[PDB]
């Protein structure tokens, strides 16, 4: 691929560098349009700026804490972190969110990597060999209320068992109801004065419920579960203005009141360098 | 002969002329078209009320003063009371439409100022309350009057900071969206042809706004001395390749 | 079974390793692709779209006036603006080019710098737009500036000049992070003649400045950006 053509002196009526940006078109003006150039070659295909590569590496999307402890006399196993569940979203952690929100619509298969790490902060004396269940819970599937109830037997829910310390790995196809996920949705679920703006089921990717399969030890064990997401077979539409302000919420474009200026102020006037 | 400044757009019984145009934008180089059968899922035979709805509808004119921040309209919401298009929008469960948008602002060769005219697909607005506060239905559905970005914040309404595009992205980066400038020196009209842009083939028209039109002063209006310090801006919108599916009773929306 | 030795890195999770993995949803049939306009295949497409530069970042608050470069009538020979060309920094940091460039470590190729004049139609100005290639200072008196790559812009019926900043570097790639060895040089604008306003018009007129990339533009070594940040995870 030619990067620049050879070009010499011009004295001409064809003036490529004058245009009208009122038209909303940016003209493809080359350096050979206004300086004398030599011939150079690209040696460059642009592969690492493909949207398959730009959105196609594993990003941490959720960190959650579950505990292995004695569950006798515990009323609310959810509140005691005997299990935990997570509505799967790619907007809770903001480095991946800003990349996805360069586009309006995005279609991809998902690849999940789930890392579980343990710690015993208070007076343990051994190695707890623990197994984590991670259960993909679609909408309308029964959600767990106990860490050991009937819902964890996974007769139709996909679940994965893996040891604490090593990881899990599975792919999930594109499960959007529409042809792509909506990163942005200027609307409502229905016509109603009170109903929520922006949050739509058009980017629902499922839900994961996590528990420790082991009963309990003498000591407590805290398990941090880190879910990493990698998009693949990515298709993206409608490029957008990039996020400039801090995010405040999942599924909403709200930015905080009294934010710091995002455009840096010069150490001088407009003539400074 | 062939001049880029002199344009005629005829849809239905409506015609727009301009003698000071700047070469209409077709968004993403895609002319609006009807839904093909290979993309369709809804089994209903669609109604195509061609000349009765695919015509220019003129909204109320705004007044661009020297302290104006800008204006935002939602589509199809800005046309919800416009003739037969507004009636079909509430009687049908489903509908898809492209648009020809024509923003008009003339002045003299003594005036200066520049309007950005931009179409934003899925312009999900931010609340001014921050946090997880929603924006209520009556604020994202203002109708023909649109949203005045110099008006004050209201409870349940959007944030109206024009520098952050009402969504937390900077004003200078709106040019990735399809746009034209109305630079008063150069042109008095902007024309943007919008195809139907959505992740679904056809959609509900009252609960969802597909695109938003923003008209934003960038270079502020400077009038010659002694002249009236304001200019009118007129928006005229024509739906095109308009389909409606799922006829039933008329929807009742908050209004 | 077949005998096997296991290599270093076994059991590691490398976040950029692209391997096949079992589907949690066997026999699932995803929604049909419909045609949607504006499909993006590569980010090098959309950095060729010009966005506005907040060149007048002299205010203590983000505002629309930060995009407006002021011109003054009775000024000969003087500077209109200046900037360095660290495109992951300064006035370029919030532009679309600068924000995509901050996802990468290395950049190369030519930049497209545009100025749109927005004054009255009965006004006239000639400006000079100078690129100073690196190894010299930012120019100080327009005589220094025109010794480098420059354009004399006559403002007329066509309101927009396009100054390509040509790739002027010995090293094949520059850092997107500001680095002195890979500094890209300086951009400056000067009154070539002056701004002449018509009668009954007064005050300042404004330039709008635009940045995009030429199609020779190269971008590599993907990295995190510092622009977005958080302290805690976000919730519903």
């Amino acid at each position, epitope marked *: 691929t030619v990067a620049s053509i050879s070009s010499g002196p011009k004295h001409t009526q064809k003036v490529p560098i004058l245009t009208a940006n009122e038209t909303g078109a940016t003209m493809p003006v080359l350096p050979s349009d206004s300086i004398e150039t030599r011939t150079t070659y690209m040696h460059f295909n642009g592969s690492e700026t493909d949207v398959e590569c730009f959105l196609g590496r594993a990003a941490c999307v959720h960190v959650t804490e579950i505990q292995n402890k004695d569950a006798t006399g515990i009323d609310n196993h959810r509140e005691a972190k005997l299990f935990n569940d997570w509505k799967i979203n790619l907007s809770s952690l903001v480095q991946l969110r800003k990349k996805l929100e360069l586009f309006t619509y995005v279609r991809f298969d998902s690849e999940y990597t789930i890392l579980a790490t343990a710690s015993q902060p208070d007076s343990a004396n051994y190695s707890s060999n623990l197994v984590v269940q991670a259960m993909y819970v679609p909408p309308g599937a029964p959600n767990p209320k106990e860490w050991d109830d009937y819902t964890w037997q996974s007769a139709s829910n996909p679940s994965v068992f893996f040891k604490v310390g090593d990881t899990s790995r599975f792919s999930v196809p594109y499960v959007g109801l529409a042809s792509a996920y909506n990163c942005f949705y200027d609307g409502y679920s229905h016509d109603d004065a009170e109903t929520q703006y922006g949050i739509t089921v058009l980017n629902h990717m499922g839900s994961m419920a996590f528990r420790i399969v082991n009963e309990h030890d003498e000591h407590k064990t805290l398990v941090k579960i880190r879910v990493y997401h990698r998009a693949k077979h990515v298709e993206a539409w409608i490029p957008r203005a990039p996020r400039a302000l801090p995010y405040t919420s999942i599924g909403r474009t709200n930015y905080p009141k009294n934010t710091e200026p995002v455009i840096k102020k010069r150490k001088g*006037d*407009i*003539k400074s360098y | 002969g062939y001049s880029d400044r002199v344009q005629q757009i005829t849809l239905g019984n409506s015609t727009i002329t301009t003698q000071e145009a700047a070469n209409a934008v077709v968004c993403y180089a895609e002319w609006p078209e009807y839904l093909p059968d290979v993309d369709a899922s809804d089994v209903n035979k669609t109604s195509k009320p061609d000349t009765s709805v695919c015509r220019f509808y003129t909204l109320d004119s705004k007044t661009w003063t*020297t*302290g104006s921040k800008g204006w935002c309209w939602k589509l199809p919401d800005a046309l919800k009371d416009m003739g037969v298009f507004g009636q079909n929008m509430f009687f049908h469960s489903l509908g898809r439409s492209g648009y020809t948008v024509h923003v008009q602002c003339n002045a003299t060769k003594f005036h200066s100022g520049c309007l950005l005219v931009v179409v934003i697909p899925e312009h999900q607005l931010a609340s001014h309350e921050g946090g997880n506060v929603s924006v209520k239905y009556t604020f994202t559905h203002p109708g023909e009057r649109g949203i005045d970005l110099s008006s004050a914040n209201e409870v349940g309404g959007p944030v109206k900071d024009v520098i952050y595009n009402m969504n937390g992205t900077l004003l200078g980066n709106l040019l990735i969206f399809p746009h034209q400038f109305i630079n008063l020196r150069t042109n008095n009209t902007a024309t943007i042809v919008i195809p139907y842009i959505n992740s679904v083939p056809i959609d509900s028209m009252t609960r969802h706004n597909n695109v938003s039109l923003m008209v934003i002063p960038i270079a*502020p209006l*400077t009038v010659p*001395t002694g002249a009236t*310090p304001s200019l009118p801006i007129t928006v005229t919108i024509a739906p095109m390749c308009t389909e409606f599916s799922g006829i039933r009773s008329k929807s009742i929306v908050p209004q | 079974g077949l005998p096997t030795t296991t290599l270093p890195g076994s059991g590691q999770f490398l976040t950029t390793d692209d391997r096949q993995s079992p589907s949690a949803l066997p026999n699932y049939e995803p929604t049909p692709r419909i045609h949607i306009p504006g499909k993006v295949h590569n980010l090098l497409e959309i950095i060729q779209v010009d966005t506005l530069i907040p060149m007048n970042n*002299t*205010h*203590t*608050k983000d505002e629309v*006036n930060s995009y407006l470069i*002021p011109l*003054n*009538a*009775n*000024r*000969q*020979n*003087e*500077q209109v603006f200046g900037t360095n060309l660290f495109i992951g920094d300064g006035v370029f940091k919030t532009t679309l080019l600068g924000e995509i460039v901050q996802y990468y470590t290395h950049w190369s190729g030519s930049l497209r710098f545009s100025l749109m004049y927005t004054g009255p139609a009965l006004s006239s100005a000639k400006l000079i737009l100078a690129y100073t290639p690196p190894g010299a200072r930012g120019p*100080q*008196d*327009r005589r220094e500036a025109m010794l480098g790559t420059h354009v004399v812009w006559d403002i007329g019926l066509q309101s927009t000049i396009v100054m390509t900043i040509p790739w002027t570097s010995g090293v094949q790639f520059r850092y997107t992070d500001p680095d002195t060895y890979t500094s890209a040089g300086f951009l400056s604008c000067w009154y070539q003649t*002056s701004l002449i306003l018509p009668p009954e018009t*007064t*005050g*300042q007129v404004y330039l709008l400045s635009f940045i995009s990339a030429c199609p020779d533009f190269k971008l590599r070594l993907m990295k995190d950006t510092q622009t977005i940040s958080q302290t805690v995870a976000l919730t519903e």
Partner: antibody, heavy 116, light 107 residues
Framework: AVQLAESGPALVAPSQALSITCTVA????????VAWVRQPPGAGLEWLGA???????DYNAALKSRASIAKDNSKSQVFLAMASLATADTAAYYC??????????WGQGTTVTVSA | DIVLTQSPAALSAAAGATVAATCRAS??????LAWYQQKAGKSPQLLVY???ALAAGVPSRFSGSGSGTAYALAINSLAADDFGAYYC?????????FGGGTKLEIK
């Protein structure tokens, strides 16, 4: 440090030309304009004029025939020369420089009095 | 020609009260206004530029507001260094005329 220093004769007769020199320091006169402002004792600031960074000047609409500003880029000196001083020209005269297209870094000022 | 009309000529209040000088112009300034304070026997000091931005070394009590033709310097909870002169000056389209002036003297 950026400093502008006024230097005047501090006593002038009427129908005699005033000549005030503005020695500047810490910047070039090829890069920044210089503003002149006077203040009669008791009354408010009045803008006299400005020589811009490359030699163009603007003045009072009322004192345009009566005042002239020039500079020397080699001596770093800006000159305010007013002719035919009436009694209204008794003031403390100040120098400023261009800053974000405005005026600041005002020097201590020289006091000018004119009488018989 | 643009003339600035500043009100009021005198304000008298205690330390901790809030004053508000008002600046009006004969034509639109597009926020190209500065505010100056001047002590007795002292050069003027730039405090507000572009009608809203505080200068260097200016405390957060001073807040410049206003746009178009009407402009306002507001001092919230006056400290002891706030007394003296206050002047408008527009920097849109030479001549760069001043306002009349506003005094702060102790109640």
């Amino acid at each position: 440090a950026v400093q502008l220093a006024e230097s005047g004769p501090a006593l002038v007769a009427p129908s005699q030309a005033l000549s005030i020199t503005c020695t500047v320091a810490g910047f070039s006169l090829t890069a920044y304009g210089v503003a002149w402002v006077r203040q009669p004792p008791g009354a408010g600031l009045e803008w006299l004029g400005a020589i811009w960074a490359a030699g163009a000047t603007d003045y009072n609409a009322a004192l345009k025939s009566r005042a002239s500003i020039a500079k020397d880029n080699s001596k770093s000196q800006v000159f305010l020369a007013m002719a035919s001083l009436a009694t209204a020209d008794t003031a403390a005269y100040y120098c400023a420089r261009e800053w974000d297209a405005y005026g600041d870094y005002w020097g201590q000022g020289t006091t000018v009095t004119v009488s018989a | 020609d643009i003339v600035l009309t500043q009100s009021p000529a005198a304000l008298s209040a205690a330390a901790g009260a809030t004053v508000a000088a008002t600046c009006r112009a004969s034509g639109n300034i597009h926020n190209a206004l500065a505010w100056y304070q001047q002590k007795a026997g002292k050069s003027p000091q730039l405090l507000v530029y572009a009608a809203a931005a505080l200068a260097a070394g200016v405390p957060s009590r001073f807040s410049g507001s206003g746009s178009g033709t009407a402009y306002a310097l507001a001092i919230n909870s006056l400290a002891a260094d706030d007394f003296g002169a206050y002047y408008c000056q527009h920097f849109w389209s030479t001549p760069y005329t001043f306002g009349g002036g506003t005094k702060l003297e102790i109640k």
